[PDB]
Design a protein around this ligand. Structure first.
Ligand SMILES: Nc1ncnc2c1ncn2[C@@H]1O[C@H](COP(=O)(O)OP(=O)(O)OP(=O)(O)O)[C@@H](O)[C@H]1O
Ligand SMILES: CC(=O)CS/C(=N/c1ccc(Cl)cc1)NC(=O)c1c(F)cccc1Cl
Ligand SMILES: [Cl-]
Length: 286
């Protein structure tokens, strides 16, 4: 289609602001479609060494075509700004719901966990590591299905070299894997560690490794220092214990453990119908 330009849109409210970006709700005049447009100031990206992250976000998102990810529909630029035209995730961040309700019941934990698993199976099947998976980066569409975002710190592993490890230090302290901290690289299984943290957080209300200082969190991660609250769905506890494993080759779902089939077969997921999840009505969050 014709390359889009800023004047092809009418902007509405600011949906959010990052360190180097503003996301605005926009309507495209010629179609009346709604988009979330992420806008970055070139001068700021250039001054602050962010060009590789912006180009990575574009490159990674352009590869994805799955219902559980924010879609990148188009990109354009003008003299001052870069623009990404994204699907609008009307219901915002998963984290908002954890905070408000405190935790999720078993049905809701299972459903949202299954969507995240399905998303990770797709991403890992394309040889992509997210590296910053966390509830703030799991958005929710109007129908309350997940829309994973934040790909500027993802990594496409090279198929040509059969690359498995990625060397950049990126992530969020509560969710960062022990291998990145101790070996200085991440792998696809690093996202499975984050998944374990997220499942724990949905059930318990807080992620498992937490402190007021990042270094204190790192020290607990590397020692596997965490505990479960007395009441925690038992099959979910078992699943978390199979994900929060220091040795990245021993996490359920990883390539060395024979991939996503065994993970989808975990007893916590016994009632899940994997094949049409994105067309199922999500359970109401109460
Ligand atoms: N597609 C979208 N639909 C709805 N809201 C969105 C969408 N994408 C991002 N947001 C919201 O806009 C803000 C996120 O912005 P963005 O990706 O620009 O930066 P960030 O990742 O939050 O920040 P930082 O770069 O500082 O880590 C957040 O509140 C986020 O939830
Ligand atoms: C043409 S290639 C391109 N060069 C840059 C990238 C960063 C900066 Cl500061 C200036 C030019 N950028 C883009 O095409 C582009 C887009 F037009 C919208 C969003 C993201 C990206 Cl990478
Ligand atoms: Cl950036």
């Amino acid at each position: 289609p014709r390359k889009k330009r800023p004047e092809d849109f009418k902007f509405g409210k600011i949906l959010g602001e990052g360190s180097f970006s503003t996301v605005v709700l926009a309507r495209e005049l010629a179609t009346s479609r709604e988009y979330a447009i992420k806008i970055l100031e070139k001068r700021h990206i250039i001054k602050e060494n962010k060009v590789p992250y912006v180009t990575r976000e574009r490159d990674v998102m352009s590869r994805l075509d799955h219902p559980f990810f924010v879609k990148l529909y188009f990109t354009f630029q003008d003299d001052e700004k870069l623009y990404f035209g994204l699907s609008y995730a009307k219901n915002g961040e998963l984290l908002k719901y954890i905070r408000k309700i405190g935790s999720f019941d078993e049905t809701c934990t299972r459903f949202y966990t299954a969507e995240i698993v399905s998303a990770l199976e797709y991403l890992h099947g394309k040889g992509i590591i997210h590296r910053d998976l966390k509830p703030e980066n799991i958005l929710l569409n109007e129908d309350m299905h997940i829309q994973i975002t934040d790909f500027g710190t993802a990594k496409v592993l090279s198929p040509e070299s059969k690359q498995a490890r990625a060397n950049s230090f990126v992530g969020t302290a509560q969710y960062v894997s022990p291998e990145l901290l101790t070996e200085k690289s991440a792998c696809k299984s690093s996202d499975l560690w984050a998944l374990g943290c997220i499942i724990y957080q949905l059930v318990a209300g807080l992620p498992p490794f937490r402190a007021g200082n990042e270094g204190l969190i790192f020290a607990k991660i590397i020692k596997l220092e965490y505990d479960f609250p007395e009441k925690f769905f038992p099959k979910a506890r078992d699943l978390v214990e199979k994900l929060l494993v220091l040795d990245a080759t021993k996490r359920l779902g990883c390539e060395e453990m024979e991939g996503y089939g065994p993970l989808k077969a975990h007893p916590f997921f016994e009632s899940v119908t994997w094949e049409n999840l994105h067309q199922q009505t999500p359970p109401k969050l109460t």
